[PDB]
PDB file of all heavy atoms in Angstrom:
ATOM      1  N   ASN K   1      32.664  17.560-130.843  1.00 57.05           N
ATOM      2  CA  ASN K   1      33.645  17.979-129.860  1.00 57.05           C
ATOM      3  C   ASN K   1      33.184  19.228-129.165  1.00 57.05           C
ATOM      4  O   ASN K   1      32.894  20.210-129.854  1.00 57.05           O
ATOM      5  CB  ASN K   1      35.023  18.129-130.463  1.00 57.05           C
ATOM      6  CG  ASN K   1      36.187  18.040-129.509  1.00 57.05           C
ATOM      7  OD1 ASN K   1      36.239  18.790-128.514  1.00 57.05           O
ATOM      8  ND2 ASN K   1      37.141  17.214-129.747  1.00 57.05           N
ATOM      9  N   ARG K   2      33.122  19.188-127.815  1.00 54.42           N
ATOM     10  CA  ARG K   2      32.718  20.348-126.949  1.00 54.42           C
ATOM     11  C   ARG K   2      33.642  21.539-127.136  1.00 54.42           C
ATOM     12  O   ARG K   2      33.251  22.703-126.901  1.00 54.42           O
ATOM     13  CB  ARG K   2      32.668  19.943-125.484  1.00 54.42           C
ATOM     14  CG  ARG K   2      31.708  18.790-125.133  1.00 54.42           C
ATOM     15  CD  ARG K   2      30.277  19.238-125.059  1.00 54.42           C
ATOM     16  NE  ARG K   2      29.415  18.216-124.483  1.00 54.42           N
ATOM     17  CZ  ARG K   2      28.082  18.297-124.399  1.00 54.42           C
ATOM     18  NH1 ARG K   2      27.483  19.332-124.912  1.00 54.42           N
ATOM     19  NH2 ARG K   2      27.395  17.363-123.818  1.00 54.42           N
ATOM     20  N   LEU K   3      34.880  21.297-127.640  1.00 55.30           N
ATOM     21  CA  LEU K   3      35.920  22.328-127.883  1.00 55.30           C
ATOM     22  C   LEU K   3      35.785  22.998-129.228  1.00 55.30           C
ATOM     23  O   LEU K   3      36.484  23.986-129.419  1.00 55.30           O
ATOM     24  CB  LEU K   3      37.326  21.752-127.769  1.00 55.30           C
ATOM     25  CG  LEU K   3      37.855  21.570-126.364  1.00 55.30           C
ATOM     26  CD1 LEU K   3      39.152  20.782-126.359  1.00 55.30           C
ATOM     27  CD2 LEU K   3      38.056  22.881-125.652  1.00 55.30           C
ATOM     28  N   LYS K   4      34.981  22.481-130.181  1.00 57.65           N
ATOM     29  CA  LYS K   4      34.809  23.048-131.526  1.00 57.65           C
ATOM     30  C   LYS K   4      34.509  24.537-131.589  1.00 57.65           C
ATOM     31  O   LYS K   4      35.224  25.235-132.354  1.00 57.65           O
ATOM     32  CB  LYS K   4      33.863  22.182-132.422  1.00 57.65           C
ATOM     33  CG  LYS K   4      33.514  22.769-133.767  1.00 57.65           C
ATOM     34  CD  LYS K   4      34.271  22.133-134.889  1.00 57.65           C
ATOM     35  CE  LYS K   4      33.461  22.133-136.142  1.00 57.65           C
ATOM     36  NZ  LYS K   4      33.071  23.504-136.621  1.00 57.65           N
ATOM     37  N   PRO K   5      33.541  25.153-130.828  1.00 54.97           N
ATOM     38  CA  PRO K   5      33.293  26.640-130.899  1.00 54.97           C
ATOM     39  C   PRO K   5      34.523  27.429-130.412  1.00 54.97           C
ATOM     40  O   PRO K   5      34.854  28.479-131.009  1.00 54.97           O
ATOM     41  CB  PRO K   5      32.104  26.827-130.007  1.00 54.97           C
ATOM     42  CG  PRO K   5      31.406  25.510-129.911  1.00 54.97           C
ATOM     43  CD  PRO K   5      32.546  24.537-129.925  1.00 54.97           C
ATOM     44  N   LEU K   6      35.217  27.009-129.319  1.00 50.40           N
ATOM     45  CA  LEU K   6      36.478  27.668-128.832  1.00 50.40           C
ATOM     46  C   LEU K   6      37.584  27.447-129.857  1.00 50.40           C
ATOM     47  O   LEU K   6      38.395  28.420-130.052  1.00 50.40           O
ATOM     48  CB  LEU K   6      36.895  27.131-127.422  1.00 50.40           C
ATOM     49  CG  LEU K   6      36.226  27.790-126.225  1.00 50.40           C
ATOM     50  CD1 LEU K   6      36.226  26.864-125.021  1.00 50.40           C
ATOM     51  CD2 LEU K   6      36.861  29.115-125.914  1.00 50.40           C
ATOM     52  N   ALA K   7      37.652  26.264-130.495  1.00 51.84           N
ATOM     53  CA  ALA K   7      38.632  25.941-131.523  1.00 51.84           C
ATOM     54  C   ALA K   7      38.484  26.835-132.773  1.00 51.84           C
ATOM     55  O   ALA K   7      39.486  27.242-133.321  1.00 51.84           O
ATOM     56  CB  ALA K   7      38.590  24.486-131.883  1.00 51.84           C
ATOM     57  N   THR K   8      37.224  27.142-133.117  1.00 46.37           N
ATOM     58  CA  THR K   8      36.846  27.997-134.273  1.00 46.37           C
ATOM     59  C   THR K   8      37.240  29.462-133.975  1.00 46.37           C
ATOM     60  O   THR K   8      37.774  30.108-134.869  1.00 46.37           O
ATOM     61  CB  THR K   8      35.342  27.856-134.641  1.00 46.37           C
ATOM     62  OG1 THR K   8      35.072  26.452-134.755  1.00 46.37           O
ATOM     63  CG2 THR K   8      35.011  28.501-135.955  1.00 46.37           C
ATOM     64  N   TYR K   9      36.977  29.939-132.733  1.00 48.64           N
ATOM     65  CA  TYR K   9      37.402  31.296-132.333  1.00 48.64           C
ATOM     66  C   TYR K   9      38.924  31.398-132.315  1.00 48.64           C
ATOM     67  O   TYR K   9      39.479  32.345-132.862  1.00 48.64           O
ATOM     68  CB  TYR K   9      36.843  31.680-130.935  1.00 48.64           C
ATOM     69  CG  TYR K   9      37.274  33.051-130.475  1.00 48.64           C
ATOM     70  CD1 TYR K   9      36.507  34.166-130.750  1.00 48.64           C
ATOM     71  CD2 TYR K   9      38.500  33.231-129.851  1.00 48.64           C
ATOM     72  CE1 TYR K   9      36.914  35.448-130.384  1.00 48.64           C
ATOM     73  CE2 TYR K   9      38.945  34.524-129.499  1.00 48.64           C
ATOM     74  CZ  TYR K   9      38.154  35.595-129.777  1.00 48.64           C
ATOM     75  OH  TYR K   9      38.568  36.863-129.352  1.00 48.64           O
ATOM     76  N   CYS K  10      39.603  30.386-131.742  1.00 46.48           N
ATOM     77  CA  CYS K  10      41.071  30.275-131.643  1.00 46.48           C
ATOM     78  C   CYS K  10      41.722  29.642-132.887  1.00 46.48           C
ATOM     79  O   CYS K  10      42.334  28.580-132.798  1.00 46.48           O
ATOM     80  CB  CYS K  10      41.467  29.520-130.360  1.00 46.48           C
ATOM     81  SG  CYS K  10      41.157  30.445-128.836  1.00 46.48           S
ATOM     82  N   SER K  11      41.508  30.257-134.050  1.00 45.97           N
ATOM     83  CA  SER K  11      41.984  29.826-135.350  1.00 45.97           C
ATOM     84  C   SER K  11      42.600  30.942-136.127  1.00 45.97           C
ATOM     85  O   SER K  11      42.152  32.104-136.003  1.00 45.97           O
ATOM     86  CB  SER K  11      40.804  29.236-136.144  1.00 45.97           C
ATOM     87  OG  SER K  11      41.222  28.763-137.431  1.00 45.97           O
ATOM     88  N   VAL K  12      43.627  30.617-136.988  1.00 48.46           N
ATOM     89  CA  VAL K  12      44.292  31.627-137.838  1.00 48.46           C
ATOM     90  C   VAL K  12      43.315  32.222-138.893  1.00 48.46           C
ATOM     91  O   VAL K  12      43.508  33.387-139.272  1.00 48.46           O
ATOM     92  CB  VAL K  12      45.641  31.173-138.458  1.00 48.46           C
ATOM     93  CG1 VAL K  12      46.690  31.026-137.360  1.00 48.46           C
ATOM     94  CG2 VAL K  12      45.464  29.840-139.240  1.00 48.46           C
ATOM     95  N   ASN K  13      42.282  31.484-139.278  1.00 47.98           N
ATOM     96  CA  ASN K  13      41.234  31.888-140.215  1.00 47.98           C
ATOM     97  C   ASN K  13      40.472  33.049-139.664  1.00 47.98           C
ATOM     98  O   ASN K  13      40.150  34.031-140.445  1.00 47.98           O
ATOM     99  CB  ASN K  13      40.278  30.723-140.458  1.00 47.98           C
ATOM    100  CG  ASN K  13      40.850  29.433-141.022  1.00 47.98           C
ATOM    101  OD1 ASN K  13      41.892  29.417-141.672  1.00 47.98           O
ATOM    102  ND2 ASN K  13      40.151  28.328-140.782  1.00 47.98           N
ATOM    103  N   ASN K  14      40.141  33.053-138.360  1.00 50.80           N
ATOM    104  CA  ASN K  14      39.372  34.101-137.654  1.00 50.80           C
ATOM    105  C   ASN K  14      40.088  35.395-137.572  1.00 50.80           C
ATOM    106  O   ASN K  14      41.214  35.470-137.009  1.00 50.80           O
ATOM    107  CB  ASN K  14      38.941  33.592-136.266  1.00 50.80           C
ATOM    108  CG  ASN K  14      37.609  34.139-135.818  1.00 50.80           C
ATOM    109  OD1 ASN K  14      36.694  34.365-136.617  1.00 50.80           O
ATOM    110  ND2 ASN K  14      37.489  34.304-134.508  1.00 50.80           N
ATOM    111  N   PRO K  15      39.500  36.477-138.173  1.00 51.31           N
ATOM    112  CA  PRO K  15      40.142  37.785-138.090  1.00 51.31           C
ATOM    113  C   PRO K  15      40.186  38.363-136.678  1.00 51.31           C
ATOM    114  O   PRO K  15      41.036  39.192-136.397  1.00 51.31           O
ATOM    115  CB  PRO K  15      39.292  38.644-139.046  1.00 51.31           C
ATOM    116  CG  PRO K  15      37.950  37.981-139.036  1.00 51.31           C
ATOM    117  CD  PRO K  15      38.237  36.532-138.881  1.00 51.31           C
ATOM    118  N   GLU K  16      39.277  37.847-135.806  1.00 51.90           N
ATOM    119  CA  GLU K  16      39.175  38.249-134.385  1.00 51.90           C
ATOM    120  C   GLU K  16      40.533  38.088-133.624  1.00 51.90           C
ATOM    121  O   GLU K  16      40.850  39.005-132.891  1.00 51.90           O
ATOM    122  CB  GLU K  16      38.029  37.480-133.704  1.00 51.90           C
ATOM    123  CG  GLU K  16      36.664  37.820-134.269  1.00 51.90           C
ATOM    124  CD  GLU K  16      35.514  37.119-133.601  1.00 51.90           C
ATOM    125  OE1 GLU K  16      35.389  35.894-133.790  1.00 51.90           O
ATOM    126  OE2 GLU K  16      34.719  37.793-132.899  1.00 51.90           O
ATOM    127  N   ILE K  17      41.297  37.034-133.921  1.00 50.67           N
ATOM    128  CA  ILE K  17      42.576  36.805-133.286  1.00 50.67           C
ATOM    129  C   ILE K  17      43.727  37.499-134.029  1.00 50.67           C
ATOM    130  O   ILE K  17      44.878  37.492-133.556  1.00 50.67           O
ATOM    131  CB  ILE K  17      42.879  35.309-132.928  1.00 50.67           C
ATOM    132  CG1 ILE K  17      43.261  34.463-134.101  1.00 50.67           C
ATOM    133  CG2 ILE K  17      41.761  34.638-132.063  1.00 50.67           C
ATOM    134  CD1 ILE K  17      44.666  33.951-134.046  1.00 50.67           C
ATOM    135  N   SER K  18      43.410  38.089-135.202  1.00 49.82           N
ATOM    136  CA  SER K  18      44.356  38.800-136.049  1.00 49.82           C
ATOM    137  C   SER K  18      44.448  40.299-135.709  1.00 49.82           C
ATOM    138  O   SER K  18      45.533  40.887-135.799  1.00 49.82           O
ATOM    139  CB  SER K  18      44.036  38.642-137.555  1.00 49.82           C
ATOM    140  OG  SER K  18      45.127  38.049-138.270  1.00 49.82           O
ATOM    141  N   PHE K  19      43.305  40.936-135.279  1.00 47.51           N
ATOM    142  CA  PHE K  19      43.214  42.362-134.931  1.00 47.51           C
ATOM    143  C   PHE K  19      44.162  42.636-133.766  1.00 47.51           C
ATOM    144  O   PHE K  19      45.036  43.517-133.911  1.00 47.51           O
ATOM    145  CB  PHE K  19      41.769  42.744-134.455  1.00 47.51           C
ATOM    146  CG  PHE K  19      40.590  42.250-135.257  1.00 47.51           C
ATOM    147  CD1 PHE K  19      39.472  41.727-134.623  1.00 47.51           C
ATOM    148  CD2 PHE K  19      40.556  42.407-136.671  1.00 47.51           C
ATOM    149  CE1 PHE K  19      38.348  41.308-135.365  1.00 47.51           C
ATOM    150  CE2 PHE K  19      39.440  41.930-137.400  1.00 47.51           C
ATOM    151  CZ  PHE K  19      38.342  41.383-136.742  1.00 47.51           C
ATOM    152  N   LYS K  20      43.990  41.898-132.640  1.00 42.90           N
ATOM    153  CA  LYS K  20      44.765  42.094-131.373  1.00 42.90           C
ATOM    154  C   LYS K  20      45.857  41.022-131.358  1.00 42.90           C
ATOM    155  O   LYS K  20      45.543  39.847-131.520  1.00 42.90           O
ATOM    156  CB  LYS K  20      43.800  41.971-130.223  1.00 42.90           C
ATOM    157  CG  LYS K  20      44.077  42.857-129.025  1.00 42.90           C
ATOM    158  CD  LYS K  20      42.876  42.795-128.062  1.00 42.90           C
ATOM    159  CE  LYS K  20      43.046  43.703-126.868  1.00 42.90           C
ATOM    160  NZ  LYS K  20      41.900  43.583-125.946  1.00 42.90           N
ATOM    161  N   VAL K  21      47.105  41.423-131.139  1.00 47.39           N
ATOM    162  CA  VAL K  21      48.276  40.554-131.118  1.00 47.39           C
ATOM    163  C   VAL K  21      48.291  39.477-130.000  1.00 47.39           C
ATOM    164  O   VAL K  21      48.745  38.349-130.250  1.00 47.39           O
ATOM    165  CB  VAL K  21      49.652  41.340-131.120  1.00 47.39           C
ATOM    166  CG1 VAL K  21      50.754  40.499-131.744  1.00 47.39           C
ATOM    167  CG2 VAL K  21      49.530  42.702-131.824  1.00 47.39           C
ATOM    168  N   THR K  22      47.885  39.864-128.794  1.00 43.67           N
ATOM    169  CA  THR K  22      47.821  39.018-127.596  1.00 43.67           C
ATOM    170  C   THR K  22      46.800  37.922-127.704  1.00 43.67           C
ATOM    171  O   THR K  22      46.872  36.949-126.966  1.00 43.67           O
ATOM    172  CB  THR K  22      47.531  39.847-126.313  1.00 43.67           C
ATOM    173  OG1 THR K  22      46.368  40.635-126.510  1.00 43.67           O
ATOM    174  CG2 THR K  22      48.693  40.726-125.904  1.00 43.67           C
ATOM    175  N   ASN K  23      45.778  38.070-128.572  1.00 48.35           N
ATOM    176  CA  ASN K  23      44.691  37.136-128.755  1.00 48.35           C
ATOM    177  C   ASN K  23      45.176  35.696-129.079  1.00 48.35           C
ATOM    178  O   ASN K  23      44.728  34.766-128.405  1.00 48.35           O
ATOM    179  CB  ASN K  23      43.646  37.585-129.774  1.00 48.35           C
ATOM    180  CG  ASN K  23      42.729  38.670-129.286  1.00 48.35           C
ATOM    181  OD1 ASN K  23      42.878  39.241-128.154  1.00 48.35           O
ATOM    182  ND2 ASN K  23      41.755  38.987-130.058  1.00 48.35           N
ATOM    183  N   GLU K  24      46.146  35.552-130.044  1.00 47.22           N
ATOM    184  CA  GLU K  24      46.695  34.248-130.405  1.00 47.22           C
ATOM    185  C   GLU K  24      47.405  33.578-129.203  1.00 47.22           C
ATOM    186  O   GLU K  24      47.202  32.393-128.971  1.00 47.22           O
ATOM    187  CB  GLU K  24      47.624  34.354-131.662  1.00 47.22           C
ATOM    188  CG  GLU K  24      49.028  34.938-131.425  1.00 47.22           C
ATOM    189  CD  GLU K  24      50.211  33.999-131.591  1.00 47.22           C
ATOM    190  OE1 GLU K  24      50.082  33.018-132.295  1.00 47.22           O
ATOM    191  OE2 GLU K  24      51.283  34.250-130.948  1.00 47.22           O
ATOM    192  N   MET K  25      48.143  34.381-128.389  1.00 50.81           N
ATOM    193  CA  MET K  25      48.847  33.917-127.219  1.00 50.81           C
ATOM    194  C   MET K  25      47.857  33.509-126.113  1.00 50.81           C
ATOM    195  O   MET K  25      48.035  32.469-125.466  1.00 50.81           O
ATOM    196  CB  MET K  25      49.791  35.022-126.742  1.00 50.81           C
ATOM    197  CG  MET K  25      50.278  34.868-125.340  1.00 50.81           C
ATOM    198  SD  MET K  25      50.748  36.465-124.638  1.00 50.81           S
ATOM    199  CE  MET K  25      52.275  36.799-125.691  1.00 50.81           C
ATOM    200  N   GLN K  26      46.776  34.311-125.926  1.00 50.04           N
ATOM    201  CA  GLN K  26      45.732  34.019-124.911  1.00 50.04           C
ATOM    202  C   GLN K  26      45.040  32.678-125.210  1.00 50.04           C
ATOM    203  O   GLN K  26      44.701  31.937-124.313  1.00 50.04           O
ATOM    204  CB  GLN K  26      44.772  35.162-124.764  1.00 50.04           C
ATOM    205  CG  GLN K  26      45.392  36.322-123.943  1.00 50.04           C
ATOM    206  CD  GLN K  26      44.456  37.409-123.700  1.00 50.04           C
ATOM    207  OE1 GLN K  26      44.576  38.500-124.307  1.00 50.04           O
ATOM    208  NE2 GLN K  26      43.500  37.266-122.800  1.00 50.04           N
ATOM    209  N   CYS K  27      44.866  32.363-126.531  1.00 49.13           N
ATOM    210  CA  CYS K  27      44.356  31.108-127.059  1.00 49.13           C
ATOM    211  C   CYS K  27      45.359  29.949-126.751  1.00 49.13           C
ATOM    212  O   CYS K  27      44.944  28.938-126.141  1.00 49.13           O
ATOM    213  CB  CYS K  27      44.092  31.212-128.540  1.00 49.13           C
ATOM    214  SG  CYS K  27      42.557  31.983-129.003  1.00 49.13           S
ATOM    215  N   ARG K  28      46.619  30.099-127.198  1.00 50.99           N
ATOM    216  CA  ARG K  28      47.654  29.055-127.077  1.00 50.99           C
ATOM    217  C   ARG K  28      47.973  28.662-125.607  1.00 50.99           C
ATOM    218  O   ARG K  28      48.097  27.488-125.337  1.00 50.99           O
ATOM    219  CB  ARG K  28      48.971  29.446-127.839  1.00 50.99           C
ATOM    220  CG  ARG K  28      50.102  28.395-127.784  1.00 50.99           C
ATOM    221  CD  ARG K  28      51.348  28.756-128.664  1.00 50.99           C
ATOM    222  NE  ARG K  28      50.984  29.068-130.006  1.00 50.99           N
ATOM    223  CZ  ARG K  28      50.898  30.304-130.507  1.00 50.99           C
ATOM    224  NH1 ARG K  28      51.240  31.344-129.736  1.00 50.99           N
ATOM    225  NH2 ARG K  28      50.515  30.500-131.730  1.00 50.99           N
ATOM    226  N   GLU K  29      48.025  29.665-124.709  1.00 52.21           N
ATOM    227  CA  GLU K  29      48.283  29.443-123.313  1.00 52.21           C
ATOM    228  C   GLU K  29      47.122  28.818-122.525  1.00 52.21           C
ATOM    229  O   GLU K  29      47.249  28.341-121.408  1.00 52.21           O
ATOM    230  CB  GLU K  29      48.745  30.801-122.632  1.00 52.21           C
ATOM    231  CG  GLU K  29      50.090  31.293-123.153  1.00 52.21           C
ATOM    232  CD  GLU K  29      51.223  30.309-123.389  1.00 52.21           C
ATOM    233  OE1 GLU K  29      51.619  29.668-122.395  1.00 52.21           O
ATOM    234  OE2 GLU K  29      51.634  30.130-124.526  1.00 52.21           O
ATOM    235  N   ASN K  30      45.915  28.759-123.190  1.00 52.07           N
ATOM    236  CA  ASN K  30      44.754  28.093-122.673  1.00 52.07           C
ATOM    237  C   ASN K  30      44.561  26.738-123.350  1.00 52.07           C
ATOM    238  O   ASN K  30      43.454  26.160-123.373  1.00 52.07           O
ATOM    239  CB  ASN K  30      43.489  28.977-122.713  1.00 52.07           C
ATOM    240  CG  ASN K  30      43.470  29.957-121.587  1.00 52.07           C
ATOM    241  OD1 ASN K  30      43.168  29.622-120.464  1.00 52.07           O
ATOM    242  ND2 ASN K  30      43.952  31.185-121.822  1.00 52.07           N
ATOM    243  N   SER K  31      45.658  26.173-123.916  1.00 53.49           N
ATOM    244  CA  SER K  31      45.734  24.938-124.605  1.00 53.49           C
ATOM    245  C   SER K  31      44.848  24.791-125.849  1.00 53.49           C
ATOM    246  O   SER K  31      44.408  23.675-126.186  1.00 53.49           O
ATOM    247  CB  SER K  31      45.533  23.730-123.651  1.00 53.49           C
ATOM    248  OG  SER K  31      46.595  23.557-122.736  1.00 53.49           O
ATOM    249  N   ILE K  32      44.558  25.920-126.516  1.00 53.97           N
ATOM    250  CA  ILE K  32      43.852  25.971-127.777  1.00 53.97           C
ATOM    251  C   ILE K  32      44.706  26.722-128.764  1.00 53.97           C
ATOM    252  O   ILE K  32      44.534  27.921-128.972  1.00 53.97           O
ATOM    253  CB  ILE K  32      42.380  26.535-127.757  1.00 53.97           C
ATOM    254  CG1 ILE K  32      41.550  26.131-126.496  1.00 53.97           C
ATOM    255  CG2 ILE K  32      41.599  26.158-129.026  1.00 53.97           C
ATOM    256  CD1 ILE K  32      41.190  24.647-126.307  1.00 53.97           C
ATOM    257  N   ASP K  33      45.710  26.025-129.328  1.00 57.74           N
ATOM    258  CA  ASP K  33      46.707  26.613-130.205  1.00 57.74           C
ATOM    259  C   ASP K  33      46.250  26.888-131.674  1.00 57.74           C
ATOM    260  O   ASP K  33      46.124  25.960-132.450  1.00 57.74           O
ATOM    261  CB  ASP K  33      47.970  25.669-130.148  1.00 57.74           C
ATOM    262  CG  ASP K  33      49.186  26.156-130.846  1.00 57.74           C
ATOM    263  OD1 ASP K  33      49.227  27.332-131.339  1.00 57.74           O
ATOM    264  OD2 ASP K  33      50.176  25.399-130.873  1.00 57.74           O
ATOM    265  N   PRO K  34      46.027  28.173-132.024  1.00 57.26           N
ATOM    266  CA  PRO K  34      45.581  28.508-133.399  1.00 57.26           C
ATOM    267  C   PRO K  34      46.505  28.030-134.523  1.00 57.26           C
ATOM    268  O   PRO K  34      46.005  27.872-135.628  1.00 57.26           O
ATOM    269  CB  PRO K  34      45.460  30.038-133.419  1.00 57.26           C
ATOM    270  CG  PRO K  34      45.316  30.416-131.992  1.00 57.26           C
ATOM    271  CD  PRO K  34      46.158  29.433-131.213  1.00 57.26           C
ATOM    272  N   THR K  35      47.771  27.811-134.221  1.00 56.50           N
ATOM    273  CA  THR K  35      48.799  27.377-135.190  1.00 56.50           C
ATOM    274  C   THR K  35      48.600  25.884-135.599  1.00 56.50           C
ATOM    275  O   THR K  35      48.954  25.535-136.700  1.00 56.50           O
ATOM    276  CB  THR K  35      50.205  27.689-134.660  1.00 56.50           C
ATOM    277  OG1 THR K  35      50.227  29.054-134.271  1.00 56.50           O
ATOM    278  CG2 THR K  35      51.291  27.453-135.696  1.00 56.50           C
ATOM    279  N   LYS K  36      48.099  25.058-134.698  1.00 55.50           N
ATOM    280  CA  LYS K  36      47.827  23.643-134.893  1.00 55.50           C
ATOM    281  C   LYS K  36      46.596  23.421-135.752  1.00 55.50           C
ATOM    282  O   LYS K  36      45.616  24.178-135.625  1.00 55.50           O
ATOM    283  CB  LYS K  36      47.535  22.922-133.566  1.00 55.50           C
ATOM    284  CG  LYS K  36      48.761  22.677-132.693  1.00 55.50           C
ATOM    285  CD  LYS K  36      48.336  22.188-131.329  1.00 55.50           C
ATOM    286  CE  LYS K  36      49.509  21.810-130.424  1.00 55.50           C
ATOM    287  NZ  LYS K  36      49.964  20.410-130.699  1.00 55.50           N
ATOM    288  N   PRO K  37      46.557  22.385-136.618  1.00 50.23           N
ATOM    289  CA  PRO K  37      45.343  22.079-137.380  1.00 50.23           C
ATOM    290  C   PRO K  37      44.187  21.703-136.408  1.00 50.23           C
ATOM    291  O   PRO K  37      44.456  21.212-135.266  1.00 50.23           O
ATOM    292  CB  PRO K  37      45.704  20.904-138.295  1.00 50.23           C
ATOM    293  CG  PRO K  37      47.231  20.892-138.283  1.00 50.23           C
ATOM    294  CD  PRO K  37      47.605  21.370-136.950  1.00 50.23           C
ATOM    295  N   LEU K  38      42.915  21.866-136.833  1.00 51.78           N
ATOM    296  CA  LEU K  38      41.725  21.656-136.021  1.00 51.78           C
ATOM    297  C   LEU K  38      41.650  20.396-135.086  1.00 51.78           C
ATOM    298  O   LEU K  38      41.343  20.571-133.884  1.00 51.78           O
ATOM    299  CB  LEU K  38      40.421  21.803-136.851  1.00 51.78           C
ATOM    300  CG  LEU K  38      39.081  21.458-136.129  1.00 51.78           C
ATOM    301  CD1 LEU K  38      38.709  22.458-135.091  1.00 51.78           C
ATOM    302  CD2 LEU K  38      37.957  21.291-137.165  1.00 51.78           C
ATOM    303  N   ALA K  39      41.922  19.210-135.597  1.00 49.29           N
ATOM    304  CA  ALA K  39      41.847  17.973-134.825  1.00 49.29           C
ATOM    305  C   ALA K  39      42.997  17.885-133.801  1.00 49.29           C
ATOM    306  O   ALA K  39      42.709  17.493-132.624  1.00 49.29           O
ATOM    307  CB  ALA K  39      41.907  16.787-135.775  1.00 49.29           C
ATOM    308  N   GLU K  40      44.173  18.262-134.178  1.00 50.61           N
ATOM    309  CA  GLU K  40      45.370  18.344-133.328  1.00 50.61           C
ATOM    310  C   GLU K  40      45.176  19.399-132.213  1.00 50.61           C
ATOM    311  O   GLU K  40      45.517  19.178-131.083  1.00 50.61           O
ATOM    312  CB  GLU K  40      46.560  18.749-134.213  1.00 50.61           C
ATOM    313  CG  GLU K  40      47.931  18.252-133.793  1.00 50.61           C
ATOM    314  CD  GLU K  40      49.024  18.825-134.638  1.00 50.61           C
ATOM    315  OE1 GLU K  40      49.142  18.398-135.810  1.00 50.61           O
ATOM    316  OE2 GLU K  40      49.714  19.776-134.178  1.00 50.61           O
ATOM    317  N   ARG K  41      44.505  20.533-132.599  1.00 48.69           N
ATOM    318  CA  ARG K  41      44.176  21.680-131.707  1.00 48.69           C
ATOM    319  C   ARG K  41      43.256  21.309-130.558  1.00 48.69           C
ATOM    320  O   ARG K  41      43.393  21.855-129.483  1.00 48.69           O
ATOM    321  CB  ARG K  41      43.535  22.831-132.559  1.00 48.69           C
ATOM    322  CG  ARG K  41      43.411  24.184-131.814  1.00 48.69           C
ATOM    323  CD  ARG K  41      42.720  25.262-132.639  1.00 48.69           C
ATOM    324  NE  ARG K  41      43.284  25.384-133.952  1.00 48.69           N
ATOM    325  CZ  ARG K  41      42.595  25.636-135.064  1.00 48.69           C
ATOM    326  NH1 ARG K  41      41.320  25.917-134.987  1.00 48.69           N
ATOM    327  NH2 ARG K  41      43.197  25.641-136.223  1.00 48.69           N
ATOM    328  N   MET K  42      42.328  20.335-130.786  1.00 44.84           N
ATOM    329  CA  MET K  42      41.341  19.870-129.762  1.00 44.84           C
ATOM    330  C   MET K  42      41.775  18.627-129.015  1.00 44.84           C
ATOM    331  O   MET K  42      41.123  18.263-128.028  1.00 44.84           O
ATOM    332  CB  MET K  42      39.984  19.659-130.390  1.00 44.84           C
ATOM    333  CG  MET K  42      39.363  20.861-131.027  1.00 44.84           C
ATOM    334  SD  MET K  42      37.674  20.628-131.604  1.00 44.84           S
ATOM    335  CE  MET K  42      37.857  19.226-132.694  1.00 44.84           C
ATOM    336  N   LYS K  43      42.809  17.935-129.493  1.00 45.69           N
ATOM    337  CA  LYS K  43      43.285  16.670-128.971  1.00 45.69           C
ATOM    338  C   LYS K  43      43.974  16.811-127.578  1.00 45.69           C
ATOM    339  O   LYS K  43      44.777  17.701-127.383  1.00 45.69           O
ATOM    340  CB  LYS K  43      44.241  16.033-130.014  1.00 45.69           C
ATOM    341  CG  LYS K  43      44.843  14.645-129.657  1.00 45.69           C
ATOM    342  CD  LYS K  43      45.993  14.401-130.621  1.00 45.69           C
ATOM    343  CE  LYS K  43      46.668  13.067-130.377  1.00 45.69           C
ATOM    344  NZ  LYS K  43      47.762  12.857-131.329  1.00 45.69           N
TER     345      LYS K  43
END
């Protein structure tokens, strides 16, 4: 899946989206929801 690297960045596992609060929202609003499981997240 071409979305896999963006899906990996936009994940709850990644501390990168945990440091800055807006990061999770910037992911979700670009249709890559960190709250959704991996397959559902890229669907």
Side-chain angles (χ1 to χ4, degrees):
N1 200 304
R2 300 283 193 187
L3 282 170
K4 174 103 150 60
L6 275 156
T8 311
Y9 178 92
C10 288
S11 180
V12 291
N13 302 333
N14 213 33
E16 295 180 291
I17 76 115
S18 239
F19 317 136
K20 216 169 182 182
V21 207
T22 53
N23 285 7
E24 77 111 28
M25 164 205 292
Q26 284 183 253
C27 279
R28 183 176 307 103
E29 295 318 297
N30 281 283
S31 291
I32 322 292
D33 188 4
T35 311
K36 283 172 176 276
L38 173 72
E40 209 186 286
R41 192 182 311 144
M42 299 187 304
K43 182 194 180 180

